[PDB]
Design a protein around this motif. Structure first.
Motif, short mmCIF file in Angstrom:
data_model
loop_
_atom_site.label_atom_id
_atom_site.label_comp_id
_atom_site.label_asym_id
_atom_site.label_seq_id
_atom_site.Cartn_x
_atom_site.Cartn_y
_atom_site.Cartn_z
N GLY A 73 9.10 60.77 43.11
CA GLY A 73 9.20 61.02 44.53
C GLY A 73 8.32 60.07 45.32
N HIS A 74 7.22 59.64 44.69
CA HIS A 74 6.28 58.72 45.31
C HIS A 74 6.15 57.48 44.44
CE1 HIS A 74 5.30 61.69 48.40
NE2 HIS A 74 5.39 62.58 47.43
N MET A 75 7.30 56.85 44.19
CA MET A 75 7.30 55.66 43.34
C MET A 75 6.49 54.52 43.94
SD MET A 75 8.93 56.48 40.73
CE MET A 75 10.15 57.64 40.11
N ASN A 76 6.27 54.51 45.27
CA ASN A 76 5.57 53.37 45.83
C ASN A 76 4.08 53.59 45.97
OD1 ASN A 76 7.98 52.09 45.98
ND2 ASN A 76 8.47 52.98 47.97
N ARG A 77 3.55 54.71 45.50
CA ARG A 77 2.11 54.91 45.53
C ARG A 77 1.41 53.92 44.60
NH1 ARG A 77 -0.69 60.80 44.25
NH2 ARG A 77 -2.83 60.01 43.98
N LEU A 78 0.24 53.41 45.02
CA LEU A 78 -0.52 52.46 44.19
C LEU A 78 -1.13 53.13 42.96
CD1 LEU A 78 -2.39 50.50 46.91
CD2 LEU A 78 -0.45 49.70 45.57
N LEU A 79 -1.08 52.43 41.81
CA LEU A 79 -1.67 52.96 40.56
C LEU A 79 -3.18 53.18 40.74
CD1 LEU A 79 0.32 50.65 38.22
CD2 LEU A 79 0.51 53.17 38.36
N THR A 80 -3.83 52.34 41.55
CA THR A 80 -5.28 52.50 41.75
C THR A 80 -5.67 53.77 42.49
OG1 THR A 80 -5.06 51.09 43.70
CG2 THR A 80 -5.82 50.05 41.61
N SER A 81 -4.72 54.46 43.14
CA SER A 81 -5.02 55.73 43.78
C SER A 81 -5.02 56.93 42.83
CB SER A 81 -4.03 55.98 44.92
OG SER A 81 -2.74 56.24 44.42
N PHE A 82 -4.82 56.71 41.51
CA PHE A 82 -4.87 57.77 40.49
C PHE A 82 -6.07 57.60 39.58
CE2 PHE A 82 -0.69 59.62 41.08
CZ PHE A 82 -0.01 58.62 41.73
N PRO A 83 -6.58 58.66 39.08
CA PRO A 83 -7.72 58.63 38.15
C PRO A 83 -7.30 58.30 36.71
CG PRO A 83 -7.06 60.86 38.49
CD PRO A 83 -6.18 60.04 39.39
N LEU A 84 -6.52 57.23 36.55
CA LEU A 84 -6.22 56.67 35.23
C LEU A 84 -7.52 56.20 34.58
CD1 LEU A 84 -3.08 54.64 36.19
CD2 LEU A 84 -3.17 56.85 35.13
N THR A 85 -7.52 56.12 33.24
CA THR A 85 -8.73 55.63 32.57
C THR A 85 -9.05 54.23 33.06
OG1 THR A 85 -7.59 54.55 30.75
CG2 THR A 85 -8.23 56.89 30.49
N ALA A 86 -10.36 53.92 33.10
CA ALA A 86 -10.77 52.57 33.46
C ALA A 86 -10.07 51.54 32.58
CB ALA A 86 -12.29 52.45 33.34
#
Ligand SMILES: [Zn+2]
Length: 62
Positions: free
Chosen positions: A1-14
């Motif tokens: 639904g939010h395919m255009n959100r930036l990956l850096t806005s998620f708490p993915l592992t460093a």
């Protein structure tokens, strides 16, 4: 639904944030375009670690 959100806005592992940036990925849609085996090949990681990214972004953008 939010395919255009930036990956850096998620708490993915460093570590995987570094890999995504260095391989040129920007958005959720850039990851969710791919199956786990496709994503693992591009990021030079194993299939389960690719699955992990995909499942997390699937639940967070829904
Ligand atoms: Zn593409």
């Amino acid at each position: 639904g939010h395919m255009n959100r930036l990956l850096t806005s998620f708490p993915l592992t460093a570590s995987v944030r570094t890999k995504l940036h260095n391989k040129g990925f920007q958005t959720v849609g850039d990851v969710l375009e791919l199956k786990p085996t496709e994503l693992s090949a591009e990021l030079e990681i194993c299939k389960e670690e690719a699955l992990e990214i995909i499942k997390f972004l699937e639940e967070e953008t829904q």
